[PDB]
């Protein structure tokens, strides 16, 4: 199976860069600071132009001191260390990284289309061939990531960026862990959490299969399967398990979701011995060409409108000052 | 005039405190109330019940909390206000600090809120007014409380709020930088490290009011960092059942912009006290506690802890002393 063969060349390469992460692949003065695309609690994201190439990138400036104050040290190293070892069409690309006395830097491909969350909200919902298009992309990405013993743990619409070509690109690996065994952290959003997680059972990759089940549902309906304005009720409703499908759900879609949204870890699609094949063959994915999608030779249902931050917000623009003094030097040397 | 005198007696006490007015062998430690550890105690002689906060000298140190704890003690013992728990005694049994306070048998607001889910706006308004006044009091002494939240507000027998946990209160004419509090209640300034002031409590009030009315707090997640991101976003969605006047108030309280945050402007509290949500509030009436509580916890008699959860009881024995000289 070319499928099995390609994931090994992939494991291999992931593994090289994983043992030997790439550091300082650029520096601040190679870029022009155009615009602040977003802000956070220990960093922001800036639209930049690489001076020599003339290409635009989304650049992440993490204030090293803030990162330590908020205890995000390894979460930070971990995301960087992962993005930098990873390579697949539908994951945002880390082009360059590097650091100052003051900051940490992560230059990503700029994806202007914004995130599926807004779009889905904007337009209400997605046709099933529409939803299936995005769904196909996730299945592959998980197949890839899981191959590397990586749990994503953060599937949700606002984490799926939509490129000019209309394809999904996954962002934010803060909570992704390389885990052979089982793990216990509560971290992903309430609507996408699997029963196991909520019961502090100690979960594994099958969680992402649960979450995919939720994404598909929301993409097809315009709301998640376990919704409630009260946080605690979101949790109860998941553990309960009762899922109702809008009239307009193909019998195929219903069947998929029953197998994805499945408490019985022994019967959940993804965790069985037949693997992702159970999903990739399911009757709801008959009209989908898996290698064409991987190669992006499949026409996308939607496309979003040299910059500019059109589909973004406006923010108070701050100087990127750098101390003459090296800050928190010891704890980030692995970056 | 009042504040003037309150600012006086608070000063007198703040510079002539009381220490070691009791001893461990004067109470029969009945049960654990909360979790450090707090125990329901009953005094031998008096026979009255109190709540005894027992602080482990060595974890305090190992956790670098000496100023903070020397502090709550110092402040608790010097404040006087209808909705502030009274410190009745204090002393160190040579291995851990002991603060003895009035017992407030009604329980955390927390457990009642979770049990019920959410209070009505009139119920919520009743509590809010009390904190609004308690903060005015406290700010007037130039104090910042910095630990507002349901699990820190006890309901007394009449259904009036009693504030415990002064763990993080500091006297701050000016500005401070310490990052403490509890994630869901932190204002952007304190997360964001460009220093902050007492306006941080009014933001917290907005969080409490919202959580009371709604049942959950405005910025919610299962990890603090995620909560911080939501707070910095500063973006808030309100339940549809929220009244418009309620919606208004929270927008003014949960203002990132210190320049338009209610309570931190020209009229101080009066902007809050005079807002349309509070129209039906007799503030002098609440201060005197001549308002009938919409809710009263079930108290049976001396020593009932039914309003509190159960907890394992470890023993408290004797064997880091030099550091608490003035405790």
């Amino acid at each position: 199976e070319s499928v099995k063969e390609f994931l090994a060349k992939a494991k291999e390469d992931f593994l090289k860069k994983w043992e030997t992460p790439s550091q300082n692949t650029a520096q601040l003065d190679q870029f022009d600071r155009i615009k602040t695309l977003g802000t956070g609690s220990f960093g922001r994201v800036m639209l930049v132009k690489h001076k020599e190439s003339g290409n635009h990138y989304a650049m992440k400036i993490l204030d090293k001191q803030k990162v330590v104050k908020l205890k995000q040290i390894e979460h930070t190293l971990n995301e960087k260390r992962i993005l930098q070892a990873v390579n697949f069409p539908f994951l945002v690309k880390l082009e360059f990284s590097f650091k100052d006395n003051s900051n940490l830097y992560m230059v990503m491909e700029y994806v202007a289309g914004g995130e599926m969350f807004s779009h889905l909200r904007r337009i209400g919902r997605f046709s099933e061939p529409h939803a299936r298009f995005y769904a196909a992309q996730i299945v592959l990405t998980f197949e890839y990531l899981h191959s590397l013993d990586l749990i994503y743990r953060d599937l949700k619409p606002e984490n799926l960026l939509i490129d000019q070509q209309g394809y999904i690109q996954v962002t934010d690996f803060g909570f992704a862990k390389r885990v052979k065994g089982r793990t216990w952290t509560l971290c992903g959003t309430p609507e996408y959490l699997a029963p196991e997680i909520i019961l502090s059972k100690g979960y594994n990759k099958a969680v992402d299969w649960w979450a995919l089940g939720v994404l598909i549902y929301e993409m097809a309906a315009g709301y998640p399967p376990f919704f409630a304005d009260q946080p605690i009720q979101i949790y109860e409703k998941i553990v309960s398990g009762k899922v109702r499908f809008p009239s307009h759900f193909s019998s195929d879609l219903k069947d998929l979701l029953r197998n994805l949204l499945q408490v019985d870890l022994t019967k959940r699609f993804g965790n069985l011995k037949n693997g992702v094949n159970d999903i990739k063959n399911h009757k709801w994915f008959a009209t989908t060409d898996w290698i064409a999608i991987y190669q992006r030779k499949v026409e996308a249902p939607f496309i979003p409108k040299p910059g500019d931050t059109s589909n973004f917000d406006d923010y108070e623009e701050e100087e990127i000052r750098v101390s003459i003094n090296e800050k928190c030097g010891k704890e980030f040397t692995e970056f | 005039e009042f504040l003037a005198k309150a600012k006086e007696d608070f000063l007198k006490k703040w510079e002539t405190p009381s220490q070691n007015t009791a001893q461990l062998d004067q109470f029969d430690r009945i049960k654990t109330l909360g979790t450090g550890r707090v125990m329901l105690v009953k005094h031998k002689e008096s026979g009255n019940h109190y709540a005894m906060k027992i602080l482990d000298k060595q974890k305090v140190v190992k956790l670098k909390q000496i100023e903070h704890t020397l502090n709550e003690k110092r402040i608790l013992q010097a404040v006087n206000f209808p909705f502030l728990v009274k410190l009745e005694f204090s002393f160190k049994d040579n291995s851990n600090l002991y603060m003895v306070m009035e017992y407030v048998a009604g329980g955390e607001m927390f457990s009642h809120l979770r049990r019920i889910g959410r209070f009505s706006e009139p119920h919520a308004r009743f509590y809010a007014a009390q904190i609004v006044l308690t903060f005015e009091y406290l700010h007037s002494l130039d104090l910042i409380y910095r630990d507002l939240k349901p699990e820190n507000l006890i309901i007394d027998q009449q259904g009036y709020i009693q504030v415990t946990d002064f763990g993080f209160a500091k006297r701050v004419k000016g500005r401070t930088w310490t990052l403490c509090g509890t994630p869901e209640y932190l204002a952007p300034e304190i997360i964001i490290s460009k220093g902050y002031n007492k306006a941080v409590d009014w933001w917290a009030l907005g969080v409490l009011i919202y959580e009371m009315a709604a049942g959950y707090p405005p910025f919610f997640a299962d990890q603090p960092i995620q909560i911080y991101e939501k707070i910095v976003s500063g973006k808030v969605r309100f339940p549809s059942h929220f009244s418009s006047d309620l919606k208004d108030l929270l927008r003014n309280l949960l203002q990132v912009d210190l320049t338009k945050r209610f309570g931190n402007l020209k009229n101080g509290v009066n902007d809050i006290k005079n807002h349309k949500w509070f129209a039906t509030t007799d503030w002098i009436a609440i201060y005197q506690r001549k308002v009938e509580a919409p809710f009263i916890p079930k108290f049976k008699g001396p020593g009932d802890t039914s309003n509190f959860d159960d907890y394992e009881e470890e023993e408290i024995r004797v064997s880091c002393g030099k550091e608490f000289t003035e405790f």
Partner: peptide, 15 residues
Amino acid sequence: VQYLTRSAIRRASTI
């Protein structure tokens, strides 16, 4: 049923 979500359990002060 005891859910460990910060929407159910007592939230501890930022240590």
